[PDB]
Specification:
part of a larger assembly; 4 chains; A alpha+beta (about 140); B mainly alpha (about 170); C mainly beta (about 260); D alpha+beta (about 90); A: about 140 residues; alpha+beta; five-stranded mixed β-barrel; 4 helices; 6 strands; D: about 90 residues; Alpha-Beta Plaits; 4 strands; about 40% strand; binds potassium ion; binds magnesium ion; RNA-binding; ribosome; giardia
Chain lengths: ~140, ~170, ~260, ~90
RNA sequence: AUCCGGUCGAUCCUGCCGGAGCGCGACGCUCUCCCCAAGGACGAAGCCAUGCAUGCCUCAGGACGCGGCGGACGGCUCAGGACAACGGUUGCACCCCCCGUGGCGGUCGCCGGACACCGCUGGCAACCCGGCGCCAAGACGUGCGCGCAAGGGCGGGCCCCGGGCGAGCAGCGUGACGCAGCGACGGCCCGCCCGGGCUUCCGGGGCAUCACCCGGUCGGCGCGGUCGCGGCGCGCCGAGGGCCCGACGCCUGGCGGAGAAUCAGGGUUCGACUCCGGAGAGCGGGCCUGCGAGACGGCCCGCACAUCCAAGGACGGCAGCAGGCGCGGAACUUGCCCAAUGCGCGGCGCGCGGCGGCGCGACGGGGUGCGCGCGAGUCAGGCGGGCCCACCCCGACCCGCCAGGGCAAGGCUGGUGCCAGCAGCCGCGGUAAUUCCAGCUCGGCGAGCGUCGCGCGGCGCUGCUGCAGUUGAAACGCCCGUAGUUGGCCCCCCGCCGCCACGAGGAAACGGGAGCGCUCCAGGCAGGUUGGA
């Protein structure tokens, strides 16, 4: 019957499911424990760090552009990341020592769109929300 | 702990699963037009309050006509549905509960009752008059547009004796 | 812990006390005495919670300091004193005498009784044993002790005690066809006649009884109290140990607001 | 005001008092105080407390402790209610 | 009990990627009124200035002191610990227990002296103490008394089977020891009660790139120790004990349950925190006093850290309540009070707990009009409250956040010209852009909307119900074969399993659910003979 039947086979039916559960990439990513170790944010929604550089990144094949990003050192584990800055003209609030709050792009650690090697993005600069800085609701000191 | 930790609370509405469906999007605003509804939540609440009384009946109807659970809870459900006027006397069968719509629930609101007896010209004027403490239920001043009026208490809906319209 | 418990949270109090879950973090903890924690009621829960002679704890104390309450003929000055099944409850200044029994929902009720009845008590023989220098003793459901009992009295019988001398004047034997009342479980409070006794070697002995309308029920032998011989030796509530079904109870409830 | 009624009267010769629930009816107007309606419910042995007004007005419910002696009130009454009536003030 | 966009010139599939719902936190923007309500848990059980968290009543005006009861309960936390703990279910004929409530009470003439508070003198930086002296008891000490505390030797029947059992159990008699406890205001002792200690059966995480493991380990005999049984410890004797029905080892950002999130049915995931149980108090150990502690708002020692100082010494433990530092994406006042609910002593005590303050974590109700009267505010009096306030009553004045090509509801002008930028996915932009930046208009949800991460759903892409294996990923090259799983037909009316039904017994809160107009409502257990089934 391609599966075992019979009134006394509960142990086998449970062993098979336990073994074949690991064959799914989603389950293996969320349950094995290697992704939690390798995750730069250590399983958190966001993380703060200091900017070490400003950079421009080429887009992928069918598009043509220079995307604006920053290399960031993490406070809590001293890892190296790169984070994207959205919203036209926003790369002008980022001095080379500016505490930044950084979150993900969505897709839970996968690159999106046309930016090669980018999985994070800046949401706050030196204490102030970057979106409200673009919408002209608050301003930086000087 | 503090005593307040033992107090219960609950959500009383369910949002739909596909938000951007056109036919129920305009069917949902004809309802906001025939009744002075503030926002979509007051529709959601209604459907939620239907979805429970529909779950009970279908549980008892799967049972047998002579079981005590049917004899007890179906009688309780019918006795509760007849006092609020959500269901009428001539339908005293548990199978008459399943074909109920939301409009039956909306028709027993105080805002709707006062419109029926023509105390208010429209439903919007009725809502305004409700907020102004201008209407009493059984000699008791009721401020709530969403108030649910029992058939016992529908003979006795008036303007309040204390009022500027008296 | 490192020692005995002296507190009792409100949600952890026995469910037949009918305590309400707001209005307090704590509940009274019954003091040790004639009755256990689970099968009792703290005395305060009658004077304040039920009869409203007092309205707070502090003014419930002063009623019991000046000794206005007698339990089995003695003034108890302790608010968490455990009063329980068959205890005589007499308040003289209001001339109220009660006997503490169970109702048909397993809760304590007070039954008015006459001055010709409050001078005696029914106890259940819990055990016979040899004490010091080999003398015989019997122990009851009230933590009472009697030396040199008449040899006929055996375990599970009930005895009748005058409430001033503290001696025995009558006894009822546990048999077939005796009138009985259940003191705990889930048939607590209802009254019937014994029609079976099934012993199981090593294990519990079960009793089958039958009400006065003929309803039959079962329980353990540790829960059946004899109240007489085909006629109850005492007074019982108006319902007389007949338990309605939920439908008839509902129609009686509908009739009260009617 | 013009309408004062009482129910749930319990005589308590242990605390030397009588306990009551009082309903006050004042359609349209206020009832001005408890010190006012104290006449309808001697006067100095009446202890009035726990008064609530319903929504819209017109109804009030409260509680009465009516003592018989005067030592009884200084003995069995909480030490802050005797200051709300001006009887001690410390 | 629902799907939709993306592989091609076009087409049907497999298959994933993306979208659409609910919940929990964090971030952004924004906020009129009222009710309910969580709040330094998240590999830092990291470190702590200051104040508070435990007191209340026999002998003289009172304090003070002596004596007594309590401080082992209550509060905090989740570090350790995976055949533990914990949940249901048994037992002690192997046990200990304060208070309280019943009992019981037979034991080979009013005694003594001395300690603190206190006087007189001192030492010391301060912590803390010394010397001499008059004085009491419901404190000790010794005791007046009809002999009886522990332990011990004999008192059983050689198919099979009341004092009290299912069960030879408990008492008593009689020979020897012993001289305990209770007696200077009469209590040793006994039953119950609550509580504890262990204990029977079933349940009780992952990894096989951990296949063999253990040697007081498995059993027996004898003593010791314990409240008590027991390899619990010690001497002697034997070689046992566990394992693919997964032992042993390793790992866990592992406290368990009652429960919670999601939602056709079957399921998946999480169990910091309210109740119940366990464990700890910087980390190891040790102990005294007591009925009860291996106690940390008790003591002693080692270690790691701090504190004052005349340099001789003395001295500490916020995972209590506030508060601070550090850390982190992430979490409030150094408030008032014993009035309530309860606990200790009886009149007090109590950072238990209660009341206010901060509080868009989250819940519930009502507004920004209607065809012409209101609420939000203001000032007074009530009501309430430990005292003030909020609510209620009477009197006189008076949005926003995201979008607009498709998925997916909603389309004209200027700027920019593969640049700037958008875009979860398809894609958009090359100087006519339905998508960038703006203006107008329009759409959705709405005092609340968007973004990030995670759980559940979507998903019959984990499949027991219920997937796939000719060619899309997938039948071992073949035969034998143990454990495992499975096994034709037949006798009915016995026994022993399983299985179905009905009972008994044990916890509430949660979850359902009968009845009841907190003005409705989230609630609560109310109420007008009652009720909480
Ligand atoms: K198959
Ligand atoms: K299959
Ligand atoms: K198979
Ligand atoms: K089988
Ligand atoms: K499989
Ligand atoms: K504990
Ligand atoms: K103890
Ligand atoms: K204790
Ligand atoms: K409680
Ligand atoms: K409670
Ligand atoms: K509680
Ligand atoms: K107590
Ligand atoms: K489904
Ligand atoms: K396609
Ligand atoms: K093709
Ligand atoms: K396809
Ligand atoms: K923390
Ligand atoms: K912690
Ligand atoms: K975590
Ligand atoms: K977190
Ligand atoms: K911390
Ligand atoms: K003690
Ligand atoms: K102590
Ligand atoms: K805390
Ligand atoms: K833990
Ligand atoms: K104790
Ligand atoms: K065990
Ligand atoms: K066991
Ligand atoms: K066990
Ligand atoms: K087990
Ligand atoms: K494994
Ligand atoms: K050995
Ligand atoms: K041994
Ligand atoms: K040995
Ligand atoms: K050996
Ligand atoms: K294993
Ligand atoms: K942990
Ligand atoms: K289901
Ligand atoms: K499943
Ligand atoms: K299910
Ligand atoms: K499903
Ligand atoms: K918490
Ligand atoms: K805890
Ligand atoms: K807990
Ligand atoms: K608890
Ligand atoms: K507990
Ligand atoms: K506990
Ligand atoms: K605990
Ligand atoms: K502990
Ligand atoms: K520790
Ligand atoms: K320590
Ligand atoms: K330690
Ligand atoms: K230690
Ligand atoms: K220690
Ligand atoms: K102990
Ligand atoms: K120790
Ligand atoms: K220790
Ligand atoms: K402190
Ligand atoms: K902690
Ligand atoms: K505080
Ligand atoms: K910080
Ligand atoms: K910070
Ligand atoms: K108090
Ligand atoms: K005590
Ligand atoms: K407090
Ligand atoms: K007005
Ligand atoms: K006003
Ligand atoms: K005006
Ligand atoms: K106005
Ligand atoms: K006006
Ligand atoms: K845009
Ligand atoms: K995405
Ligand atoms: K998509
Ligand atoms: K697409
Ligand atoms: K153009
Ligand atoms: K799935
Ligand atoms: K599913
Ligand atoms: K499904
Ligand atoms: K198949
Ligand atoms: K392949
Ligand atoms: K292959
Ligand atoms: K292949
Ligand atoms: K094959
Ligand atoms: K194979
Ligand atoms: K083979
Ligand atoms: K074969
Ligand atoms: K074979
Ligand atoms: K085989
Ligand atoms: K087999
Ligand atoms: K099998
Ligand atoms: K088999
Ligand atoms: K077969
Ligand atoms: K069965
Ligand atoms: K309970
Ligand atoms: K009655
Ligand atoms: Mg504790
Ligand atoms: Mg050997
Ligand atoms: Mg748990
Ligand atoms: Mg827990
Ligand atoms: Mg906490
Ligand atoms: Mg402690
Ligand atoms: Mg310790
Ligand atoms: Mg931070
Ligand atoms: Mg409202
Ligand atoms: Mg599935």
């Amino acid at each position: 019957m391609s599966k075992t039947s019979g009134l006394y086979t509960a142990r086998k039916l449970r062993t098979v499911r336990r073994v074949n559960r690991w064959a799914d990439k989603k389950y293996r990513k969320a349950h094995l424990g290697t992704w939690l170790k390798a995750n730069p944010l250590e399983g958190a929604c966001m993380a703060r760090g200091i900017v070490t550089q400003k950079i421009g990144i080429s887009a992928k094949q069918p598009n043509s552009a220079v995307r604006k990003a920053v290399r960031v050192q993490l406070t809590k584990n001293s890892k190296k990341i790169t984070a994207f800055v959205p919203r036209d003209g926003s790369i002008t609030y980022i001095d080379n020592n500016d505490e930044v709050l950084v979150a993900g792009f969505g897709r839970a650690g996968r690159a999106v769109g046309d930016i090669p090697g980018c999985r994070f993005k800046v949401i706050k600069v030196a204490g102030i929300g970057l979106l409200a800085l673009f919408l002209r609701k608050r301003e930086k000191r000087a | 702990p503090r005593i307040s930790r033992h107090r219960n609370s609950s959500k009383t509405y369910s949002t739909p699963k596909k938000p951007f469906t056109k036919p129920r999007l305009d069917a949902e605003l004809k309802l906001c037009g025939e009744y002075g509804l503030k926002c979509k939540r007051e529709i959601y609440r209604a459907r939620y309050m239907l979805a429970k009384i529909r779950r009970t009946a279908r549980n008892l109807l799967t049972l047998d006509e002579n079981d005590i659970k049917r004899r007890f809870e179906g009688a309780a459900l019918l006795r509760r549905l007849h006092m609020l006027g959500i269901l009428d006397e001539e339908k005293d069968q548990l199978d008459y509960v399943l074909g109920l719509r939301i409009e039956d629930i909306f028709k027993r609101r105080l805002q709707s009752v006062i419109v029926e007896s023509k105390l208010a010209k429209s439903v919007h004027h009725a809502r305004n008059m409700i907020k102004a403490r201008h209407i009493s239920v059984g000699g008791q001043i009721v401020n709530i547009p969403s108030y649910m009026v029992r058939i016992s208490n529908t003979s006795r809906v008036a303007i309040a004796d204390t009022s500027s319209l008296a | 812990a490192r020692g005995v418990r002296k507190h009792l949270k409100r949600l952890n109090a026995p469910k037949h006390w009918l305590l309400d879950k707001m209005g307090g973090i704590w509940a009274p903890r019954p003091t040790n005495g004639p009755h256990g924690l689970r099968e009792c009621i703290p005395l305060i829960l009658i004077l304040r919670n039920r009869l409203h002679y007092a309205n707070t704890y502090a003014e419930t104390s002063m009623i019991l300091q000046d000794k206005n309450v007698l339990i089995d003929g003695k003034p108890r000055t302790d608010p968490t004193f455990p009063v329980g099944f068959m205890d005589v409850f007499e308040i003289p200044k209001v001339h109220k005498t009660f006997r503490v029994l169970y109702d048909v929902k397993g809760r304590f009720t007070l039954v008015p009784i006459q001055s010709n009845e409050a001078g005696f008590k029914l106890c259940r023989v819990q055990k016979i044993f040899l004490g010091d220098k080999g003398m015989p003793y019997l122990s009851t459901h009230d933590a009472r002790t009697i030396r040199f009992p008449h040899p006929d009295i055996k375990t599970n019988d009930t005895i009748k005690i005058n409430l001033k001398t503290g001696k025995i004047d009558e006894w009822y034997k546990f048999d077939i066809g005796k009138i009985v009342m259940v003191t705990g479980g889930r048939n607590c409070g209802r009254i019937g006649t014994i029609q079976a006794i099934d012993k199981h070697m090593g294990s519990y002995t079960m009793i089958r009884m039958k009400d006065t309308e003929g309803t039959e029920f079962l329980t353990r032998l540790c829960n059946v109290f004899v109240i007489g011989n085909d006629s109850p030796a005492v007074a019982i509530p108006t319902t007389k140990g007949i338990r309605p079904d939920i439908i008839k109870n509902r129609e009686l409830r509908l009739r009260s607001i009617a | 005001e013009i309408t004062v009624k009482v129910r749930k009267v319990l005589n308590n010769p242990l605390l030397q008092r009588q306990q009551c629930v009082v309903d006050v009816l004042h359609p349209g107007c206020t009832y001005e105080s408890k010190e006012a309606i104290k006449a309808k419910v001697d006067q100095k042995n009446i202890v009035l407390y726990g008064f609530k007004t319903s929504f819209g007005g017109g109804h009030t419910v409260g509680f009465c402790n009516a003592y018989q002696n005067m030592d009884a009130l200084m003995k069995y009454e909480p030490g802050f209610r005797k200051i709300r009536c001006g009887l001690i003030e410390a």
